[PDB]
């Protein structure tokens, strides 16, 4: 049963970065918040919920 | 065609709570909740049953958009006897009163209206129909009237505003039951007059998907109206895929 129920992928965050992701940081105090960066120079703040 | 003394053979429609009166011409009718009066001067049909006198109200498609939806052949209407329905943009009892007839004594209809002047006629109608709860409030802030509304099986939106996708969504999240009904009537001119009617309808459909409302069906309302389409959808919180 473990093998048929193994469905690890839940989704993806938004539409992603323009370039490759190279930095991910967590808000160690808040459970559902996540900050990402890319080689594009872009940084985003996510609401994972 | 349907003169005063002319008499018709009334037989049930495919949708529960809707009836067809045959004859030399066919009329869509719904049973009168409050016999002996007309809310906006429609024709009424009396049938003697064992004998009590029941009364049927003629539903004019040209005045009520929902009626025009029936005649074009909407496959699924979530409005049916014994269901709670939320009607947004109830200008007056021209169309709500017909919806109240379909749900019957057991069901309820939540009519929501903003402008006070048409509301005054909504309230006066509401007294005759116990199963209508008129809410004179702005549909853009559902939080204001959350005390008054429970879960509603279907949400019907006739509101003529440019930002419909928000009002229908916000009231959908708070009050619509999962797998519940959503019926939206879209007027191309009101939302965005610069672009053709087809583009607007495609745009509104996409907004509904983003708001987790899987859209089931679209129908255009011609010849009854120009540049109108009724989109029927289900509110699938589990997953729209």
């Amino acid at each position: 049963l473990e093998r048929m129920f193994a469905k690890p992928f839940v989704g993806q965050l938004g539409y992603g970065h323009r370039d490759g992701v190279y930095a991910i940081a967590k808000n160690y105090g808040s459970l559902n918040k996540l900050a990402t960066g890319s080689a594009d120079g872009v940084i985003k703040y996510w609401n994972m919920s | 065609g349907a003169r005063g003394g002319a008499k018709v053979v009334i037989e049930p429609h495919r949708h529960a709570g809707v009836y067809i009166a045959r004859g030399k011409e066919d009329l869509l009718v719904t049973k009168n909740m409050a016999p002996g009066e007309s809310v906006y001067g429609e024709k009424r049909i009396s049938v003697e049953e064992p004998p009590t006198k029941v009364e049927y109200r003629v539903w004019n498609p040209f005045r009520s958009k929902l009626a025009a939806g029936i005649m074009g052949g909407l496959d699924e209407l979530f409005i049916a006897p014994g269901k709670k329905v939320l009607y947004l943009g109830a200008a007056s009892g021209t169309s709500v009163s017909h919806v109240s007839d379909v749900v019957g004594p057991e069901g309820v209809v939540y009519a929501v209206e903003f402008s006070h002047r048409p509301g005054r006629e909504l309230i006066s109608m509401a007294k005759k129909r116990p199963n209508i709860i008129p809410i004179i409030e702005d549909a853009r802030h559902p939080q204001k009237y959350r005390m008054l509304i429970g879960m509603v099986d279907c949400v019907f939106a006739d509101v003529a505003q440019p930002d419909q996708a928000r009002i229908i969504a916000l009231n959908s999240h708070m009050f619509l039951k999962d797998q519940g009904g959503v019926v939206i009537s879209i007027k191309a001119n009101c939302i965005d007059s610069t672009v053709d009617a087809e583009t607007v309808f495609a745009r509104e459909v996409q907004k509904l998907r983003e708001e987790r409302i899987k859209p089931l069906e679209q129908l255009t309302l011609e010849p009854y109206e120009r540049d109108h389409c009724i989109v029927v959808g289900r509110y699938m919180r589990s997953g729209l895929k």
Binding site: - | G1, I20, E25, E217
Partner: protein, 49 residues
């Protein structure tokens, strides 16, 4: 040529009514019911797949 294209177009408007319903100004006089009748078991509606 002008008279022929005049007659061709008006014929086309007549056929377009047969293919689909077309707005024809709306309401003229008291509502006399559905002129040609209503079909209970038919749906002219376009379903989202």
């Amino acid at each position: 040529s002008r008279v022929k294209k005049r007659k061709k177009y008006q014929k086309a408007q007549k056929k377009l009514k047969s293919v689909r319903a077309v707005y024809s100004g709306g309401q003229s006089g008291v509502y006399e019911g559905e002129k040609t009748g209503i079909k209970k078991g038919l749906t002219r509606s376009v379903k989202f797949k």
